[PDB]
């Protein structure tokens, strides 16, 4: 439940 | 090449719902987490929600939890804000933004901020009805003289939603033109006038007539801003 | 939440001058911190994050630099392209940006011209007053418009609007309209607007008397 | 008092075609330049092209050299930029602006709204 962790492809 | 393209937005009343959309070309939408973030009229920005790449995980700011829906069709490049229970205070352009994926050279990896934006659909939410303005001269004067220059204008009052446009003597007339930015009336109406300064010999032989154009209301009028005796 | 302070809240500077911006947390952010830049009628822009790196793009004259709590933009020398609004933002918890430093245009003073103008025949048989002062083409952006109904200062009834930095001569024009309804418009004589400035050595009046005009 | 109103812009396929129109109104443009400039997404406007008086040549940008041409209507008060073998990167919003200075200096004091000009699929 943590929004900044990375949201894109390939973190 | 990237480009996103928003559409969507407009005058919806308080309860109601709309869906925002963002076209996305020129990169590869499907591996970017994506973004919405607002502005209301003449305030900062402030971030509403957050969707993966991959559509699975959503974030969203507390204001609007339980409210709008973020969502995406990776097949169409499309990312989706769905404003359900809308209330004045959401009003803003709402510009979507994609997250800033970096890597440096030795492969540590950013993100979180917003490299590339929309060009914002503005979402006006309102219990006012489409209305034309008033239009009133801001007649000139003594009062409005100041050494050889003299102001006269147009008072363009109680209409919505925005946008007006103002024009002088057909658009003959340019030099000097000041027209203020409209301010939302307590009523919910807005209003604003243009003015515009001249010679003031020319008070008595050339006539001033202000051209104001409202096209949601159809509203079309010319008025003559003739002189006063103050 | 995390806040973000940004300081000063308007640098007014000129084309080669050196700019520097400062944002404020209310708690280390490390350095996850982004600068923008954004012009009126258009997005943002991001010039700087991981509070020093340059977005590709970006002129390098753009340089950030600190971490924890405090952070600086420098633009090594403005160029006009650079007069804007700057914010800075953070990503260390949820996203949450600071209130903006506008960057604008500096130039010589210019006292205002100060106008005022009655309400129309026409609105007045239509139950309201707007009465409109107008202060032109003045800088800095700093005045007090007063309004003044039968020489009592008035309070709470008026709404302004200033225009942005005029393209060509870089003034600013503001507008300042009291509104009365037409029965309490008519129980009162002379309306003033007074207009203070730091051009002004004194403060300007303009008045009328209701009925002479 | 000068405005120009741009137009022509949109959507093209890689290698395509489009041309953009700068209208001035308020000013007989013949005795002087009008240059193109571009901007894409979170970049500084960046020169493309110039026209000068006629006779006087055409400059261009190393970008867009061997594909767009900058002409002149002068009886229309109208530059124009023909832009052919369209790629991905140069989509971007298109300016266009008169040099005030007829000696060439580039005084570029009055500029279109700008026109967004797509390459894409």
Redesign the interface.
């Known amino acids: 439940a943590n929004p900044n962790v990375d949201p894109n492809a390939n973190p | 090449?990237?480009?996103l393209v928003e559409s969507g937005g407009g005058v919806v009343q308080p309860g109601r719902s709309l869906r925002l959309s963002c076209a996305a070309?020129?990169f590869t939408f499907?591996?970017?987490?994506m973004?919405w973030?607002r502005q209301a009229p003449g305030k900062?920005?402030?971030?509403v929600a957050?969707?993966?790449?991959?559509g699975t995980?959503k974030?969203y700011?507390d204001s609007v939890k339980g409210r709008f829906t973020i969502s995406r069709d990776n097949s169409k490049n499309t990312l989706f804000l769905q404003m359900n229970s809308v209330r004045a205070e959401d009003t803003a352009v709402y510009?979507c933004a994609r997250?800033?994926?970096?890597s440096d050279s030795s492969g540590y990896?950013?993100?979180?901020?917003?490299?590339?934006?929309?060009?914002?659909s503005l979402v006006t939410v309102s219990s006012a009805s489409t209305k034309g303005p008033?239009v009133?001269?801001?007649?000139p004067?003594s009062?409005?003289?100041?050494?050889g220059?003299a102001?006269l204008?147009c008072?363009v009052?109680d209409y919505f939603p925005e946008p007006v446009t103002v024009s002088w003597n057909s658009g003959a007339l340019?030099?000097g033109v000041?027209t203020?930015?409209?301010?939302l009336?307590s009523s919910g109406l807005y209003?604003?006038?243009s003015?515009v300064?001249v010679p003031s010999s020319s008070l008595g032989t050339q006539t001033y007539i202000c051209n104001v154009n409202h096209k949601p209301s159809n509203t079309k009028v010319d008025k003559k801003v003739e002189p006063?005796?103050? | 939440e995390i806040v973000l302070t940004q300081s000063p809240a308007t640098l007014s500077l000129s084309p080669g001058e050196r700019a520097t911006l400062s944002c404020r947390a209310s708690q280390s952010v490390s350095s996850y911190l982004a600068w923008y830049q954004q012009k009126p009628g258009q997005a943002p822009r991001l010039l700087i994050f991981d509070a020093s790196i340059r977005a590709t793009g970006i002129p390098a004259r753009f340089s950030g630099s600190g971490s924890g709590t405090d952070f600086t933009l420098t633009i090594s020398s403005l160029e006009p392209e650079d007069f804007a609004v700057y914010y800075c933002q953070q990503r260390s918890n949820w996203y949450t940006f600071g209130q903006g430093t506008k960057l604008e245009i500096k130039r010589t003073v210019a006292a205002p011209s100060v106008f005022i103008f009655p309400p129309s025949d026409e609105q007045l048989k239509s139950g309201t007053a707007s009465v409109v002062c107008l202060l032109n083409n003045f800088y800095p952006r700093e005045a007090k418009v007063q309004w003044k109904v039968d020489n009592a200062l008035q309070s709470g009834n008026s709404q302004e609007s200033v225009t942005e930095q005029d393209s060509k001569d870089s003034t600013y024009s503001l507008s300042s309209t009291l509104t009365l309804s037409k029965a309490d418009y008519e129980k009162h004589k002379v309306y003033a607007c007074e207009v203070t400035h730091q051009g002004l050595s004194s403060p300007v009046t303009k008045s009328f008397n209701r009925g002479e005009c | 008092x000068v405005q120009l109103x741009x137009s022509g812009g949109g959507x093209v396929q890689x290698g395509x075609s489009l041309x953009l129109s700068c209208x001035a109104x308020x000013x007989x443009x013949x005795x002087x330049x009008x240059x193109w400039x571009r901007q894409x997404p979170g970049x500084x406007r960046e020169x493309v092209x110039x026209x000068x008086x006629x006779x006087x040549x055409x400059x261009x940008x190393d970008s867009x050299x061997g594909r767009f041409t900058x002409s002149x209507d002068x009886x229309x008060x109208x530059x124009x930029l023909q832009x052919x073998x369209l790629x991905x990167x140069d989509x971007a919003x298109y300016y266009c602006x008169x040099x005030x200075x007829x000696x060439x200096x580039x005084x570029x004091x009055x500029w279109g709204x700008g026109t967004x000009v797509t390459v894409s699929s």
């Open positions: 090449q990237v480009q070309s020129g499907s591996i970017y987490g973004h973030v900062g920005l402030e971030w957050l969707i993966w790449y991959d995980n974030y700011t510009y997250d800033a994926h970096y990896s950013s993100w979180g901020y917003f490299d590339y934006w929309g060009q914002g008033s009133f001269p801001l007649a004067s009062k409005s003289t100041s050494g220059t102001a204008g008072l009052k340019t030099s000041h203020f930015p409209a301010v009336q209003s604003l006038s003015v300064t006063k005796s103050c």
